[PDB]
A paper describes a structure:
Here, we show that a generic and kinetically biased ‘Gembody’ (Gb) interface, previously discovered through trapping in crystallo, can also be trapped in solution by kinetically controlled side-chain-to-side-chain bond formation in a manner that leads to ready generation of complexes; these display ideally balanced interface flexibility and yet relative complex constraints, in turn allowing rapid cryo-EM structure determination, even of small targets. Ultimately, after a survey of in-solution covalent bond-forming methods exploring differing natural and unnatural amino acid residues, we found that Cu(II)-catalyzed oxidation at a pivotal C12 residue site (together with the presence of needed Gb ‘gem’ substitutions previously discovered through iterative X-ray-guided engineering) offered a route to direct and rapid, high-yielding formation of disulfide-linked homo Di-Gembody (homoDiGb) without side reactions (for example, off-site oxidation) to form a robust covalent interface. Furthermore, the success of DiGbs for high-resolution structural solution is enabled by their relatively small mass contribution to the imaged complex while increasing the maximum particle diameter for better particle alignment. In summary, our plug-and-play DiGb strategy improves cryo-EM resolvability and resolution of small proteins through constraint and increased particle size with a simple and robust workflow and can even enable simultaneous structure determination of two challenging targets in one dataset.
In an essentially identical workflow using heteroDiGb GbC4:GbEnhancer, the SPNS2:heteroDiGb:sfGFP complex structure was determined to 3.90 Å overall, with 2.84 Å for SPNS2 and 3.75 Å for sfGFP, individually. These results clearly demonstrated the efficiency offered by heteroDiGbs in duplexing structure determination. A potential caveat to our Gb technology is the possibility for clashes between targets, which we observed for homoDiGb analysis of sfGFP and overcame through the use of an alternative heteroDiGb system.
Numbering used by the authors:
A (entry chain D): 1 to 52, 52A, 53 to 82, 82A, 82B, 82C, 83 to 110
B (entry chain B): 8 to 227
C (entry chain C): 3 to 118
Write the structure that this text describes.
């Protein structure tokens, strides 16, 4: 019925720039909010970034605020996240989430600064 | 509890001097691991967002929740169903304040009944719950269950992520302690986790807020 | 407790060594194995080393990786050669107390591994 596929994960040396992209299938993206969680190996999952359904404003956590600079295009049906500045704390992996009806988690991709 | 069982849950609570009561009805199928409910607040307006109390009204009863065959004997809640049990829950919101709730669940007559008393504290204007910024969506969750022989009760813990219109996610810590009213065998399980998957819908038939609610809870 | 370390993102054709050590005294008594989980696929068996010393590797990886248990250091290291993009799976280290085949009891947090 509905699926989420996120790609663009790659290892980046400190100070580099990386772009992640989460695409959707089986539902509109314009009518719902989007979110990006992060979890480190052997650590509880946490919400790092996200973007409201209306798209007027986006909300980040304390540490990453201003780093992610997320964006969305309704026609593309894909959301883009920009790494901007990079720090070792970003070694944790990312997950793409949008819950229409029953909640849905995307498989996401793993990214580590090294 | 075996087979389809009706349920009627009525509760009342106070938050910052605002008193509100919610009553609801529905049915649960333990064999199929499904639960359907419909709530309504008799009061005109409920001061806080519904989900922060939908979670409490849902996780107040675990008898309906289905468990695997190996864990059927392990369950404590089903064992204490005949004479009921009392739960004390403390929920610490991420800077939005705190809930303290006490509930009693028991099989009265041939129907299951749950009653809850709630107190809200440490709330300030401009907060997420004060501003009603939380949306109508929900998220699946995992709850960890562990025994305690010193208190002769089962203790549950987990973290609940509530959503905000601007996208802000509130991680709230939920802790539960249970005491069996009855004197029968407890069969307390050492450790096990229940995954809950809940979806919320509205019925356009009526103007009253419906909160038509569906749960699928499975242990492991 | 099982601790696994020594993993990091690299290019194709590089050789990296993942070191697994159990803080619980001796490790020789414990059959030590390595598995890989792909980003969105089922877990797979990387390799295993047992009490008798026999080393078993999956056919896909045969001839490329090697497990060595060091008597001097009491630690089990998986050395990789000719690493390829197919090996992006995160690697985990496990152990079993029973010499015969079965499920491994212990487990490790794991480290990410990548290629070009």
């Amino acid at each position: 019925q509905v699926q989420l596929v996120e790609n663009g994960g790659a290892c980046v040396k400190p100070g580099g720039s990386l772009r992640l992209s989460c695409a959707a299938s089986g539902f509109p993206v314009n009518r719902y909010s989007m979110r990006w969680y992060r979890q480190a190996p052997g650590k509880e999952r946490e919400w790092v970034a996200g973007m409201s359904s209306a798209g007027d404003r986006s909300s980040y956590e304390d540490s990453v605020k201003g780093r992610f600079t997320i964006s969305r295009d309704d026609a593309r049906n894909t959301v883009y996240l920009q790494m901007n500045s990079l720090k070792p704390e970003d070694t944790a992996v990312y997950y793409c989430n949008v819950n229409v009806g029953f909640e849905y988690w995307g498989q996401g991709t793993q990214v580590m600064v090294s | 509890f075996t087979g389809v069982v009706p349920i009627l849950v009525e509760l009342d609570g106070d938050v910052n001097g605002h008193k509100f009561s919610v009553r609801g009805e529905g049915e649960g199928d333990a064999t199929n691991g499904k639960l359907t409910l419909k709530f309504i607040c008799t009061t005109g307006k409920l001061p806080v967002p519904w989900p922060t109390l939908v979670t409490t009204l849902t996780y107040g009863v675990q008898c309906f929740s289905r468990y695997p065959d190996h864990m059927k004997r392990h369950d404590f809640f089903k064992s204490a169903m005949p004479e009921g049990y009392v739960q004390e829950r403390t929920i610490s919101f991420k800077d939005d304040g705190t809930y303290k709730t006490r509930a009693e669940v028991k099989f009265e007559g041939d129907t299951l009944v749950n009653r809850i008393e709630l107190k809200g504290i440490d709330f300030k204007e401009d907060g997420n719950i004060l501003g009603h910024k939380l949306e109508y969506n929900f998220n699946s969750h995992n709850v960890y269950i562990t025994a305690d022989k010193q208190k002769n009760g089962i203790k549950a813990n987990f973290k609940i992520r509530h959503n905000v219109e601007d996208g802000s996610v509130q991680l709230a810590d939920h802790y539960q302690q249970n005491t069996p009213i009855g004197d029968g065998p407890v069969l307390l399980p050492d450790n096990h986790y229940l995954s809950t998957q809940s979806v919320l819908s509205k019925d356009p038939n009526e103007k009253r807020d419906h909160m038509v609610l569906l749960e699928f809870v499975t242990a492991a | 407790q099982l601790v696994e370390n020594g993993g990091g993102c690299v290019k194709a054709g590089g050789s990296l060594r993942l070191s697994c050590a159990a803080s619980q005294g001796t490790l020789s008594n414990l059959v030590t194995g390595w598995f890989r989980r792909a980003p969105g696929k089922e877990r797979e068996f990387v390799a295993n080393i047992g009490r008798d010393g026999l080393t078993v590797y999956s056919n896909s990886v045969k001839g490329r990786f090697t497990i060595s248990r060091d008597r001097a250091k009491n630690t089990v290291y998986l050395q990789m050669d000719s690493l390829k993009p197919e090996d992006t799976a995160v690697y985990y280290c496990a152990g079993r107390l029973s010499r015969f085949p079965g499920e491994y009891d212990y487990w490790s947090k794991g480290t990410p591994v990548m290629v070009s």
